[PDB]
């Protein structure tokens, strides 16, 4: 059931912003590891004395990496005279965030019709304001409200190229890497208590619960009207034999925050071949593959969607497969992106639900919790 | 003149330690950019609840990348019960260093006969103590004194594998990259005042001035007995037309610190081909090449050391060449390693002074200051 209750007009995911200690090194690592091109910058070379910000793009996916300079470079500025291109940025907030949480997502940014209206309606409906609407060069409006922990939901609206004051990167510095990633599918938060987190976010957005369908967690998914903005949230389940990985996250992250970004690929086999080639030469590692038990049982579950060749190809690459009543989900998880066992990435591809493809086709992998387990009965095999 | 006045027995450079916000992303970037292998780790997976530390090696060169975890993970420990593998590490010092200076070198580590003696003799001769000698698993002794700014000179001595509590990285995670880099040749500091810095360091080490031979700086080089540990120091020259790049460093770094690491290659042409291939796909950028004027004048200066083919090969790769009275220096500089215009890397190869090659053969490039200038008379050509 989709009541289409959005309290303001939401379009799509726009960008994800990581707060870093050194934006250059994280951005270069991510560019090589994920096959994203350097597309825009805002830094000393563009007159920004406040923060260094580098944008990576792959298809529609935009990753922004930002770090503070010495405050001394901008100590004479005030907000009316700032050279920062992102006016919500604050040196102290960014250093506090990074020392508390380590490398991670500060902003989940969605494009909206009118960022000033979205902010006003959000706060009127319970959103905790984080940064008020500011109009950038009479062209772009940006506003921020708290989402969970120290993560903000960022509204961006365009009258009519990333943000004013960002410069397009020169082609010599912009190598056209591409491993097939095309857009952000969903962004997932970990919280101590799911109920209060859902009531808060659904309260100020009007996002509705996206329907799903005893290891670690309870979750629920909030969705915009066309279900293209998807925001799952997890809480830990305590008292289990194996300690909840949500609780481990909360401990190492110093509380709630963004757990994973799921990135849609136009060809998950090519994406995984390319990413795995680079795992040990600067890119990303992947979680341990499920046993061949798992793939020996995939024929009985998705043998009508994937050929015998394509399922064995899944086993080469360690890809997981799940199915709901509308479509099929191919998915795989990286190891944590940084020092702490906190944020990681999911690569996904969805098949089915063609009308364009409707959002969330195939779900989020809930059936794989039982199936992985089942599959680990190989120790008795 | 080499008075061989070392106040304690010094062997060679041992490692360089970077203090980072996220050690994983810097280490992976550096590994790919410089062709260094992941060789050892100390982190949560090895029981270290305090800091994440990753070691990269190429030949004899050792780069260590360290970042703090949340203090909460280790809040119950005391120094007698610490799980840190580097006992000098302190969360507050590391966060303070990184917020002040950005990504950069915290420790220049040299191997000595007896780290406890080196510490005691150093401090008896004016060294400011930073971390007292500590014996690690009755096998390794480590001690630290202040060098300049917040950089420490670290003494390491071995009774008889990097440090106790570090684990060798599994071969699957350890790809054998190698672009030809083999050892640290010299490590250079920038200070506001050269005189007091030299008197201090030469005062507690007994290092002697290594002989050299109006753009930016004055410098001098301190050297151990066999001149294999080489520590140049620069100060700005004020009142010039072009602002001193040493002063720019001091401003962006929030004071004195390490300016560059010079890494010896066994084949600088191969190293530069390999590094430049990767500049735009996650590796390192290089400073702008000198004009073809410069290479059109290299035949008259080093045409007896490099063939016409090898000099044109220098012009392809942007390599600089200098010569003193003992040998020839091939050198090239990266752009800054991180967000701030502070630390960068030099790649070098030295030819001559064979007896083994004596240290500092060919100097440090002082003649290239005049020659670059001269060469930029092409705007009138
Ligand atoms: O869990 C949910 C519920 C909310 C919706 C959502 O999108 C997801 C997933 O995407 C998902 N689904 C599956 Cl089936 C598994 Cl097994 C997952 N975690 C494995 C994993 C654990 C730790 C590390 Cl460090 C890396 C990987 C994840 Cl995170
Ligand atoms: O200067 C000294 C004197 C002390 C001994 C020493 O080892 C060096 C050099 O190695 C050196 N020699 C030369 Cl000839 C040049 Cl032009 C240099 N700087 C260019 C450069 C400037 C800014 C950035 Cl960001 C990158 C590069 C350097 Cl740093
Ligand atoms: Co997911
Ligand atoms: Co040098």
From Swiss-Prot, chains A, B:
Pathway: Amino-acid degradation; L-phenylalanine degradation; acetoacetate and fumarate from L-phenylalanine: step 3/6; Cofactor biosynthesis; prenylquinone biosynthesis. Its EC number is 1.13.11.27. Binds 1 Fe cation per subunit. It holds the Pfam family Glyoxalase. GO terms for biological process: L-phenylalanine catabolic process; tyrosine catabolic process. It catalyses: 3-(4-hydroxyphenyl)pyruvate + O2 = homogentisate + CO2. Its main location: cytoplasm. It is an enzyme of class 1 (oxidoreductase). Keywords: Cytoplasm, Dioxygenase, Iron, Metal-binding, Oxidoreductase, Phenylalanine catabolism, Repeat, Tyrosine catabolism. InterPro entries: 4OHPhenylPyrv_dOase (IPR005956), 4OHPhenylPyrv_dOase_C (IPR041735), 4OHPhenylPyrv_dOase_N (IPR041736), Glyas_Bleomycin-R_OHBP_Dase (IPR029068), Glyas_Fos-R_dOase_dom (IPR004360), VOC (IPR037523). SUPFAM superfamilies: Glyoxalase/Bleomycin resistance protein/Dihydroxybiphenyl dioxygenase. Fe cation binds at residues 186, 260, 346. It is found in: Cytoplasm. Disulfide bonds: none annotated. GO terms for molecular function: 4-hydroxyphenylpyruvate dioxygenase activity; identical protein binding; iron ion binding. Its cofactor is Fe cation. Belongs to the 4HPPD family. Homodimer. Catalyzes the conversion of 4-hydroxyphenylpyruvic acid to homogentisic acid, one of the steps in tyrosine catabolism. NCBIfam families: 4HPPD. This is 4-hydroxyphenylpyruvate dioxygenase. It comes from Arabidopsis thaliana. The lineage of its organism: Eukaryota, Viridiplantae, Streptophyta, Embryophyta, Tracheophyta.
